Design a protein around this ligand. Sequence first.
Ligand SMILES: NC(=O)c1ccc[n+]([C@@H]2O[C@H](COP(=O)([O-])OP(=O)(O)OC[C@H]3O[C@@H](n4cnc5c(N)ncnc54)[C@H](O)[C@@H]3O)[C@@H](O)[C@H]2O)c1
Ligand SMILES: NC(=O)c1ccc[n+]([C@@H]2O[C@H](COP(=O)([O-])OP(=O)(O)OC[C@H]3O[C@@H](n4cnc5c(N)ncnc54)[C@H](O)[C@@H]3O)[C@@H](O)[C@H]2O)c1
Ligand code: NA
Ligand code: NA
Ligand code: NA
Lengths: 300, 372
Amino acid sequence: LSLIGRDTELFHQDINANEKELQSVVSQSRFLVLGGAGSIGQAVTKEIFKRNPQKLHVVDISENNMVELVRDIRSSFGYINGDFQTFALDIGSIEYDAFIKADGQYDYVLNLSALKHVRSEKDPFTLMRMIDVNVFNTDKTIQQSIDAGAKKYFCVSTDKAANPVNMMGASKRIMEMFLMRKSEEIAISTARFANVAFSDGSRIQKNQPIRYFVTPQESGELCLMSCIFGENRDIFFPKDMARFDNLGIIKNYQQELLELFEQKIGQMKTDRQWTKEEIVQLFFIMIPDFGHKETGKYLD
Amino acid sequence: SILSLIGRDTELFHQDINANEKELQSVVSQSRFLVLGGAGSIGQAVTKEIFKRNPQKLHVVDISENNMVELVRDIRSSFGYINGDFQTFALDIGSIEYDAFIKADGQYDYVLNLSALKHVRSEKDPFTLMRMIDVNVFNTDKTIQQSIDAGAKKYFCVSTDKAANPVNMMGASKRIMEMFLMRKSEEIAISTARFANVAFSDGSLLHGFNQRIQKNQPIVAPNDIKRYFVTPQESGELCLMSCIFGENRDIFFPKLSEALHLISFADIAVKYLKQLGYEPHLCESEDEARELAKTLPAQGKWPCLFTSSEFFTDKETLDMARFDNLGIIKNDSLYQQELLELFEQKIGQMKTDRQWTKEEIVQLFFIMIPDF
Ligand SMILES: NC(=O)c1ccc[n+]([C@@H]2O[C@H](COP(=O)([O-])OP(=O)(O)OC[C@H]3O[C@@H](n4cnc5c(N)ncnc54)[C@H](O)[C@@H]3O)[C@@H](O)[C@H]2O)c1
Ligand SMILES: NC(=O)c1ccc[n+]([C@@H]2O[C@H](COP(=O)([O-])OP(=O)(O)OC[C@H]3O[C@@H](n4cnc5c(N)ncnc54)[C@H](O)[C@@H]3O)[C@@H](O)[C@H]2O)c1
Ligand code: NA
Ligand code: NA
Ligand code: NA
């Protein structure tokens, strides 16, 4: 916070003016946080936890990082009287589906799960996984939230207003299209942001050599602010410019493109083979001005 | 530095490694390797052991894209680059994606599986427990079958931490895995390792000490639990030795040398705080500790809360002659076809029903392992 060089909170004024309702609403509410052991997900979870939630379940595929989340929560805040549980699960698995079928009762579902790295686009196999995790897992969990009568689904929008340049952004833009179809049935709000300092994946232990930033805690409050107070299709961002002081709001598909997407990806999976180029060609149909190029190819 | 923390000053396998270095280098340079769970704590270590000996082919697979980035950065600064086929893939071994990766390629000489769910608490609920069964039993059995299908010469994976009966579902899962492994070992050479505590491995109490220090939080550690500790590199060296030199069914493990001492977790914390330039302050309360953590680190003290509450049995066939530093158990565990089929049938049906209870799994585990 001072490590990135700043005096104060970005949202000093905004959470202040709403703290009591934030407190109020969290007290009487039930929360499912997907990807909750990730860098943004740990901060969102910690923001829900310190406000005394009635129910807070955290799901994340990383068994190790979840353990740390918990350790961190115990030291920071101690213990809470609501029902706080954690589950080291893959959101796309039968185990997660069983989890939901056995309970599934939440008011707010927040999804900070993702594959986000450029490594992950280099090969058709991880690229397919990125699609599963960023697009289809998001679509399925929104459906599950709808079927449970959740009030609100939060997720993290693309990082940029404009056109994706890589496969990760493209996957986020495609995810958004599936969101738009779902927003006919449940309120959906997103957060658009950039550069949470010290995020996972962003040397001294191993004696090896070694812009604007926001803190992890600031990223958790925004997601929370959008979750609780965001209207359907709202995208909250860090600064409708009149509702809040440091928070902005972007007020925000083709059925046949979505169908074509599910069909093509579906067939590739059935065939049990596909090339990166197949997927890239499909993306270009999905996103018209997709400014992906073959200049990466010439980079070693 | 890790060594000095675990009350030792010299590597464990310096003699066995040095004695076999030339042959290690010959083998690695003409062989293809697949490391599953290779972004994990032992995974990375064995991946580095392979990489530095200039392998023909080395493919790393793990669900953590973040820890993979760390593995590659570490490899780049430690060793640089090789001519051979080094690639990483952030894939879940249970997935269509991973199966399509194997169908397209799968051509490896040596397949190493350091993937797992390992936290005892992953027993809490029936959903995490089912995942642990999928990751520790079924993924292992499948990747072995995929290795037989591609003509791999050797599959390596981890053994149960102890020779004694399991006491929790974790150990039972690894014990059930071993039954599946024994069946597969009638078709391909399989060898394993049994490890001491690997110092600072991800998710461990020790790894926790780093986090606590980084987050200005109290250190918490049992003062009444002692363990043997090894370094990450030592874990990696043991994997590679069992991999390259293990015979079908050999369990490699570190001999208790005169250097290896039992040390308590509290004792490691104190050593570790002093190496960081801090003096431990013994607190007698969580609440106290939390408050003292805000101001004490400034004045070079750290609040501490110190709490309290065999690699081989005697009927195991050993080879203690082959290596100086490494012991070999000649595993002769058995399986019954019918109990393996039962387990696959009953687990498959729980998955079909989309519902199951913890106690249903426990009951199946009692049939699989009667003395559990
Ligand atoms: N950190 C930043 O500065 C930043 C900036 C812009 C956008 N974002 C976006 O915010 C989101 C989170 O970013 P992050 O920095 O927190 O990423 P992260 O890697 O730190 O956390 C992602 C989490 O998702 C989990 N996950 C992946 N697949 C899963 C699955 N199948 N089931 C359950 N969990 C799964 C991972 O274990 C990880 O904990 C991402 O979409 C990222 O693109 C982050
Ligand atoms: N660390 C120790 O002290 C220790 C001691 C004795 C035995 N062991 C055993 O050694 C093995 C590894 O220990 P570790 O300390 O390196 O654990 P670890 O948690 O650091 O690493 C396990 C790795 O497996 C990966 N993984 C899990 N599921 C996967 C999947 N479905 N697909 C792809 N990757 C997957 C994880 O992301 C992780 O990188 C485990 O069986 C453990 O029980 C460890
Ligand atoms: Na060869
Ligand atoms: Na092929
Ligand atoms: Na071949």
